[PDB]
Amino acid sequence: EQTVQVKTTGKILQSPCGPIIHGLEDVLIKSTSISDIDGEKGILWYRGYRIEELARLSTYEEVSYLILYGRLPTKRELEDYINRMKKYRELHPATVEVIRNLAKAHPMFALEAAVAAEGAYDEDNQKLIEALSVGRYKAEEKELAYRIAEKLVAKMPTIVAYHYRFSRGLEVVRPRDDLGHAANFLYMMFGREPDPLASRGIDLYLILHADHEVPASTFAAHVVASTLSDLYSSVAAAIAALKGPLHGGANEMAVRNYLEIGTPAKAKEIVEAATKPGGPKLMGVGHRVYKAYDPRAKIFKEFSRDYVAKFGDPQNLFAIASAIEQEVLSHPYFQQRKLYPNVDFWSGIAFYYMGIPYEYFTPIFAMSRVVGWVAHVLEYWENNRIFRPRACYIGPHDLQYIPLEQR
Amino acid sequence: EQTVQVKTTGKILQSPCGPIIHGLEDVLIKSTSISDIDGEKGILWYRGYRIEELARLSTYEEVSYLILYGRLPTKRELEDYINRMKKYRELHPATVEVIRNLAKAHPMFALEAAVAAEGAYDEDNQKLIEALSVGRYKAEEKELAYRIAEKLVAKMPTIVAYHYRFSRGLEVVRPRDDLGHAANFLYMMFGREPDPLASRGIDLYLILHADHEVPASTFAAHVVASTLSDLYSSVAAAIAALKGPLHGGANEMAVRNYLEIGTPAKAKEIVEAATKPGGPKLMGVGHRVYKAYDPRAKIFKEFSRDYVAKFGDPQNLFAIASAIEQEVLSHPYFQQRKLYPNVDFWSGIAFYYMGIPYEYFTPIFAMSRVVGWVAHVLEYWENNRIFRPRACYIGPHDLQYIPLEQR
Ligand SMILES: [Mg+2]
Numbered sequence A, B: 001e002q003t004v005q006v007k008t009t010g011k012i013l014q015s016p017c018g019p020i021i022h023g024l025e026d027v028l029i030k031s032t033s034i035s036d037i038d039g040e041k042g043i044l045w046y047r048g049y050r051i052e053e054l055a056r057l058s059t060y061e062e063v064s065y066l067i068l069y070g071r072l073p074t075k076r077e078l079e080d081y082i083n084r085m086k087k088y089r090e091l092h093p094a095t096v097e098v099i100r101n102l103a104k105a106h107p108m109f110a111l112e113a114a115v116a117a118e119g120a121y122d123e124d125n126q127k128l129i130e131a132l133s134v135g136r137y138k139a140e141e142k143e144l145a146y147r148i149a150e151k152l153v154a155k156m157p158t159i160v161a162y163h164y165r166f167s168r169g170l171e172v173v174r175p176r177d178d179l180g181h182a183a184n185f186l187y188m189m190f191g192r193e194p195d196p197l198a199s200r201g202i203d204l205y206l207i208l209h210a211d212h213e214v215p216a217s218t219f220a221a222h223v224v225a226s227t228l229s230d231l232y233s234s235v236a237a238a239i240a241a242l243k244g245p246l247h248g249g250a251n252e253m254a255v256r257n258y259l260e261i262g263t264p265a266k267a268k269e270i271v272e273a274a275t276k277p278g279g280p281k282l283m284g285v286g287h288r289v290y291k292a293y294d295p296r297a298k299i300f301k302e303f304s305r306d307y308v309a310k311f312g313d314p315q316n317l318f319a320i321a322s323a324i325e326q327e328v329l330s331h332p333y334f335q336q337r338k339l340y341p342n343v344d345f346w347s348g349i350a351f352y353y354m355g356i357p358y359e360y361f362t363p364i365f366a367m368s369r370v371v372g373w374v375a376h377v378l379e380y381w382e383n384n385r386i387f388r389p390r391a392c393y394i395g396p397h398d399l400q401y402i403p404l405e406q407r
């Protein structure tokens, strides 16, 4: 037994067993080469590449390859990958039936259940499970794991879209091999090939949210994977965590708030009210890591501007958000505390205008982040260790059982 | 930002961001009053009561009440609880269809998906989700949470049994209101009221595995619950973790090993071989916490003795296990290194003889542990904090994007 000095910005709880870092805030679980953030400068990298470059020059197909494999693909590697992903988009009939049965339920339950279901009949997954059951994880198993990772990234939009269609009493729209990842998602949701601007927005969103820190969803994936449980189950657990209101829902709440506000003229007073104790907090402003404008927000804001330039801003969402942004950027309270817009400030606007129901916002985040989840699991598996935390017992000992009739 | 002293018996990895406690071994996440283990003396308590006393005088219905509510029930409370649990046993038709669709899959996938499915249409769950979405968790919500916790404990055996039946192409056997929790499970599995001794075995097993500090499955439930995700989703995540070979399988492997050994005469040579590197090693001998005979093992061994005294020991599992146990206990090596049998050394024997397939062993563990999982979640929710661990980036920055054709 040894003592370790752990730096945390979180709250510490007192216990007879020693201090407890509440929510293990800032506690390190591993080193990673997946993504990095410079919170002071407001820079995000995926596998060494700045998000600006990837958003500008790449696609979710290429970025997902980068996140999963650790480098940019060659032309042949990307072509083969795209073709594998296209083939993988379709779900097993049992999975589709699971989704159908959960058509009237919240989409996140359908995602959890569908991911587990799809994992149940995946032959590679079964093979990998057999291998890990005897502690074998060598070249062949790693190949299975990467194939499974690809499948999970490929299938997530299909699960989401199918649920959307069934939930609306619409006929399911199956994946089209001739469409890209983002375009095909919109096609599956709405049954028509999407406008290229709309497709670009989805692709950009997927790129921008592919990996970031170790939120509770990514952490859940690690804990499940740490027992050598399968990749599908690890992603299902990630989705279970993601559905909690403390993980996500900010981009939805930001849009609902903009609608409530109704007029950009209120921006100044809203921002002022947010500087006072008990005041309604501004959704998508401030960040635990970024003490600068979130680079993802800068990029998505520009996409949003393009979207409303083409399709209009009928609910004045972009106007309202823009007015609030300008007040946030000029208010000393926010400036002094380095509180800036984050990507959630903007990202729900296009979704809302595209006709994506609010309840599908978080599922779309899962569509993006699934690649980060699987890449994180595979990385942890390079040096796996089952998680074995503890609790401090403060209950009594040796209570005497009293017969039922005497209680 | 502050520095906290964290004690650990695990491996520490240094990083640019600080020390990494690999697997978060021994890292405190909360104070608890649910269960406690004295590994040196081989004592286990649930809510202050020794496991020996509970195994001797209680039932899973009463022990589950104890674990969930923190005290022993009065006669009226127990009667009412038992009746609620009986009412909750049956699954929603959508859940049954989910299980049917996964009939040919491994039961743990069915459990994960079925638990999510059941939570999807549970009205109480929906109401609790609504409340937590706006940060409300007061008396009314806690009442919902406990109702949901009871449902999860009540339903787990139904899910398991229905999957078993469907996996064998049989019609489901719905829950019998006149049977106890353990007896009803056997009735649902096999379609006949069980022999009292078999029911006792199931009840005992359920009591004995109800909680055991904070393994990866219980931790997974915490991580998911920490986002204020729902109880069903938290349990589905716990199951996902439980499915991993590092979390279970030992009781099955012990039995397969006894079958391979075939003759108790080999006990001495097998145990002698285990004292050399390496090795092989004896299944269910030694424990990370118990440095004494696992109290659960002592109790379950005696039940197993009773079971084979009545029904026989046709595969000589008890004879083989007993021979090995005697050698382990008399060999100085094991005594000196505090290596004793743990519950896994014995617990698969009765199940095997009862006709429970190996793949249902871990599902039955889930039937037991679900009460610990839900109790742990509710406990955490008394002072919830979302888990916020982090990873330390090690790798390049500012790599230059190269056009596809030039790679
Ligand atoms: Mg522009």
Ligand SMILES: [Mg+2]
Residues within 6 Å of the ligand: B302, B306
């Ligand atoms: Mg006896």
